[PDB]
């Protein structure tokens with residue numbers, strides 16, 4: 001039941017896919033054009049922030065089931081199944097990957113689009129492979145999207161909610177489908193986790209899922225902003241609607257918006273694809289609009305409280321990464337908040353358990369046209385230090401360390417006991433009793449807040 | 451354990467609420483202004499299409515735990531807890547109309563002589579309980595009264611046609627109460643009242659009044675959003691040859707999204723989603739906020755209700771004179787006679803406007819569809835002359851150019867295509883609810899036009 005597999009692209013998705021498939025007994029070749037990334041992996045290091053991944057990689061390297069190389073030809077010759085797992089920030093990489101398989105392949109290949117790619121990409125992949133073959137075998141291209149979450153990727157892969165497989169129903173298609181069935185059998189020994197459909201529907205599914213997740217978030221963010229206008233508590237509302245099983249409890253946390261390298265990119269790509277086919281996605285456009293403005297809500301509340309000129313003010317920032325348990329700064333709400341406060345003259349002292357180095361890098365690039373503003377941005381070693389002389393503390397990313405802080409320690413440090421909370425971590429009444437002026441998103445402030 | 455309760459407004463919400471609460475041992479007085487409705491209930495009839503309701507009513511009348519009356523003063527004197535369950539239809543500007551709610555409140559204030567818990571069970575905008583309190587307090591001040599009270603929010607989450615089951619086995623019970631002295635007194639009374647429902651699982655969510663009020667709108671708005679979300683994707687699926695039902699399985703299998711309420715089709719209707727979505731939009735706009743997503747959700751639903759006529763016009767032409775269409779399904783959803791905002795009404799108007807003849811079938815809603823469609827098209831008598839209603843699903847297809855499925859009644863899920871093949875002109879089906887597998891339709895020689903999925907080969911050809 002063991003298969004020879006190649007993963008093309010050893011980024012987050014490709015690396016966990018390859019290592020975990022090796023771990024169930026497949027013989028896996030992980031290919032990447034990035035020689036440093038490959039050297040690092042071959043040296044025993046892991047280029048990414050993923051719990052449990054180092055140990056999976058190590059034991060499968062030792063067992064002879066997992067290799068890392070930049071050797072394109074060797075990669076093609078190895079894998080009967082070729083997973084395309086390159087980035088999609090733009091399809092040249094996906095297509096270049098396809099051409100290489102076509103340029104070197106010798107027997108039947110199943111080519112698996114695992115990267116998130118627009119509907120119709122498998123057809124373009126097929127054409128690229130075909131024409132290479134023309135210059136000189138059969139194959140079929142399958143869609144098998146990834147549903148991993150950054151920082152939880154090993155668990156997400158090893159215990160998936162479902163595995164979606166899009167395949168043609170022609171002869172090479174059914175042969176590919178049988179091979180994918182064999183490949184994923186170890187995940188299907190209890191509940192059937194695999195969902196088979198046609199290629200285009202599988203392609204569409206990945207965008208639709210991320211789009212729905214984003215829609216839930218922006219939906220609650222609009223209601224949170226309304227809650228702040230008419231005296232309601234969005235967390236009460238979240239539990240009140242989540243308890244309808246047709247809605248469910250997850251991804252309904254209002255706050256300072258969504259970021260990351262997935263939702264913004266995928267919802268924008270779907271909006272673009274639709275418009276290119278002559279349809280305006282009204283709901284998704286609203287979703288994207290709402291999120292862009294939601295990343296300004298913390299600054300809106302701060303300006304309402306302190307005025308437009310924040311010169312002479314200092315704000316402590318708790319959280320920089322787009323979500324907890326990652327160092328990923330891509331589309332992080334913290335970047336918008338920091339730019340806005342710096343533009344208004346404030347000093348910023350920022351803390352994040354892991355993302356400080358990457359945050360300093362990308363915020364400096366964000367603000368390259370105003371290099372002097374960076375003179376007012378500092379990053380500290382521990383969360384309490386950020387609060388020194390602060391007019392207010394601003395919570396952006398709900399790392400666990402922020403959930404139960406030492407408010408007495410903070411009270412000896414800050415200038416005024418005011419908190420703006422983009423993630424709704426604390427009970428407003430508790431904040432009231434502690435003499436803290438509390439400004440959450442969509443919930444009534446502490447008594448001091450009004 | 452038993453408490454004396456009054457329900458003000460004996461429409462479906464009030465009737466089901468009153469009868470089911472009498473059935474757990476409470477002594478319930480159901481008040482309504484409509485003397486005919488009350489006469490009918492006292493003669494053992496039921497004004498609504500709710501399975502099981504007539505039986506619960508009969509049992510509790512016999513037990514002396516359920517009374518029906520138009521006597522307002524008797525109603526107020528009876529109930530220590532007064533549920534306001536009157537209707538909240540759209541006002542002219544689309545906001546919730548609170549005239550009946552406030553009239554009920556004033557009646558309580560004008561007659562009450564001891565502590566009252568006033569329960570807003572009607573769907574009412576955030577802030578309504580405060581207006582109810584102001585109105586009750588005004589009536590008490592006029593009277594020189596010393597009486598205290600508290601207004602609680604306790605929304606209803608019943609589905610029409612399944613109300614008894616939804617009430618007796620709720621997913622949750624939402625109770626919004628103030629935390630002042632009268633408010634805590636009320637909360638404890640509400641806890642007592644619903645105790646039987648929390649015996650084994652805690653089903654009640656307690657929160658503040660405004661959050662309870664908001665919860666009801668938010669829940670219906672989210673359900674509507676899931677539907678319009680999938681309808682937009684269905685229309686896109688057609689453009690790049692994907693299958694919306696495969697996408698539904700593919701995203702519904704993420705438990706963060708869930709499987710329910712992801713059925714694309716010819717749109718949502720009924721007496722709740724359209725009015726509640728519009729009322730929330732209005733409430734927000736009156737507070738200076740534009741709800742961009744909900745406005746989009748409403749806009750796509752409006753256009754979705756035109757999709758079936760669009761497909762039919764694409765297939766047969768702008769002029770449908772001399773064409774006949776069979777309509778399967780009239781009610782806004784299965785298992786009800788409710789015609790409010792039904793997609794069938796828009797479809798039928800568009801087809802008649804273009805000259806078509808229509809033969810319509812619904813297992814239950816024919817009487818009501820007759821009434822409202824005659825109203826819809828009052829300006830166009832000649833259109834109504836081309837509309838008929840049949841008593842048999844197959845008879846609708848007599849001489850029909852196509853069959854159009856609008857409401858997924860179970861009887862439609864297993865058609866007798868032999869019976870149909872004897873009747874229709876051409877085996878063409880436009881399916882607003884995606885009942886059948888396209889491949890299966892291709893095999894039976896049916897030209898099948900679903901929403902957001904590839905059709906049969908005949909449809910493609």
Ligand SMILES: O=C(O)[C@H]1O[C@H](OP(=O)(O)OP(=O)(O)OC[C@H]2O[C@@H](n3ccc(=O)[nH]c3=O)[C@H](O)[C@@H]2O)[C@H](O)[C@@H](O)[C@@H]1O
Pocket residue numbers: 146147148149150210213217250251252253254255256257258259260261262263322323324
């Ligand atoms: O396409 C992908 O690769 C992945 O994208 C997301 O994963 P990810 O972006 O890592 O993280 P999420 O946990 O979805 O968080 C996304 C953003 O939403 C925010 N969020 C999340 C949930 C919520 O209720 N509210 C909310 O604001 C988070 O703070 C974060 O900024 C999806 O959750 C994965 O299923 C998907 O595979």
Ligand SMILES: O=C(O)[C@H]1O[C@H](OP(=O)(O)OP(=O)(O)OC[C@H]2O[C@@H](n3ccc(=O)[nH]c3=O)[C@H](O)[C@@H]2O)[C@H](O)[C@@H](O)[C@@H]1O
Pocket residue numbers: 606607608609610670673677710711712713714715716717718719720721722723782783784
């Ligand atoms: O406010 C209310 O009293 C009730 O409103 C709705 O109940 P209802 O209007 O009876 O009907 P639904 O079953 O929700 O159907 C609404 C519409 O959505 C359509 N729909 C539903 C589900 C779906 O996946 N797709 C879809 O188009 C249905 O055909 C129907 O036209 C809610 O479901 C109840 O929870 C709520 O208590």
